[PDB]
Amino acid sequence: ITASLVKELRERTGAGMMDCKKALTEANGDIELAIENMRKSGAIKAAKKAGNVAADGVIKTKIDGNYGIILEVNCQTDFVAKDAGFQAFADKVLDAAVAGKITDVEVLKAQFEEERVALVAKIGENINIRRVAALEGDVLGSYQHGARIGVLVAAKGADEELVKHIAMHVAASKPEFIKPEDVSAEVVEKEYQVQLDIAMQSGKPKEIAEKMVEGRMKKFTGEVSLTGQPFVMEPSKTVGQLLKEHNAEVTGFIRFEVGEGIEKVETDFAAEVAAMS
């Protein structure tokens, strides 16, 4: 076991220097066996990292005709999110999700678990295929706001530029409904009672409050729906007005943002250093 051989194993796997020597030594110099052994060791290294909050990473999107996939792959730092190895992994997962039309993230996770483990073993951060979704439509378009936000939009009667602008709008304005009439009556009813309660305690007379809340309901459904929001590139019109102008229609959209619903860990460097002192 020489420095050259250790250098070769590290060149092939990117594994830590000492992990490489240990693996080569137990394999008695066999590169291929050392590699196979590191698969076993790597699974436990990944397991130790699995508890680490992975709130950074990338959103990726890929369209294949009438089928589109949006994907979140997480890591711990944006340094790793920019890395070529991490990027190639997320891209590979994305490709497989599209080719096989895989929308069950557990199926996706299972297919790439060994590759994920090999990657975690060399990068040393928790990495996780977090979620995947498909969108289907007549015309599909995507928008990536860096690696942080991804959007798919399905549309009818809309050219490439229009679809792109709407996806950019969705990236910025985060609607959760296509049209205001899509908001269920139950949701509107609950929200009505919320606003009426707020209005009442503020001292507004019942008859005035009820009329004001009625106005707020039109505001509410317009604000959570795509067609009801002001177009971010020309806010003097709503997206709905924009679509009517182009004889077009939006049939679906999905917006992923990296780290949504993951509690951000608040770190204090000075304090953590002081503690160790």
Partner: protein, 363 residues
Amino acid sequence: TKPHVNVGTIGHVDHGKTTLTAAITTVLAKTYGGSHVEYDTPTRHYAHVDCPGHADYVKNMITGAAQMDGAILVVAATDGPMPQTREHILLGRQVGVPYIIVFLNKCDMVDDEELLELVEMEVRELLSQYDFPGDDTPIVRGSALKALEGDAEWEAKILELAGFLDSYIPEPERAIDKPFLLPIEDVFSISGRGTVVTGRVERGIIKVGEEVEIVGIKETQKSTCTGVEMFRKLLDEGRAGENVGVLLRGIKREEIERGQVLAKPGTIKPHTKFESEVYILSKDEGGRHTPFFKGYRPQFYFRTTDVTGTIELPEGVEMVMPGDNIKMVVTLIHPIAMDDGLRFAIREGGRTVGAGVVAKVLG
């Protein structure tokens, strides 16, 4: 008053950045006495931050936080460089950190000498691939933990690291030692005397009888300082940090404008076009509520005045949201005195919505 140096640690999340910083403070205190950490060597005072995130560091390097005079790259000797070590060094080149020192950590866990050399060689090559001088780079072989526990042999390595911070990072240049520059805020004419411009001396010293150039906005003009005063009291010289009035010979007050700069001749030039790193305030930080696009036409506030500019977004970028940080090429509608590293605010209607730093002057 001893020189102030801003340093930072960068490296893998498990390779010992926090442990090292704790060891540094402990060993330096044990030897010399005495969100950032501070520690002292006999000749220098250090301010030390961590760089856990790329975008996070760029944003702070823009929004005011001191720019590193040098960085300590922390690489565990057990692993050697990680794939993301490229990204750590790339950040350094991006923010233009001028010096990088390497601390090889956890050497208390690697026996083989020949493997340590392979780790060192890999590091030097990564450094050189991003145009840092890998062959000349100081690489300390240490153990942060063992040093922190009081092991004398490894405490010496912390002192060795401190020695390189002292010798390999050039003494930061005091403002008073830089070439004279004064951002002009107001201009008055005093019948009998002449023209006086007021401002706070940004750097250097202005003395009576010295030539100055008036740079920015209009054609550069030359003049001579015929007097310096503070609160209607004549000084012999104005120094960096002082609010003064500089009396000029020959120049009429219609020939000087707020936003222009007084400067030692030949030391600063006017420009209109530049590359920059820009940060846009979020809504919660009191910024814009909505994104902007390619035709955005804001004001760039340099020192004392707004200058309208148009922007070029990087290829692949058609939208900028509040809270984003991005690179952009700016073209001002008229020239302003500037050099690499000059900070500015981005404003609209007179309200600050962002900040930036000039990264590269183009025209």
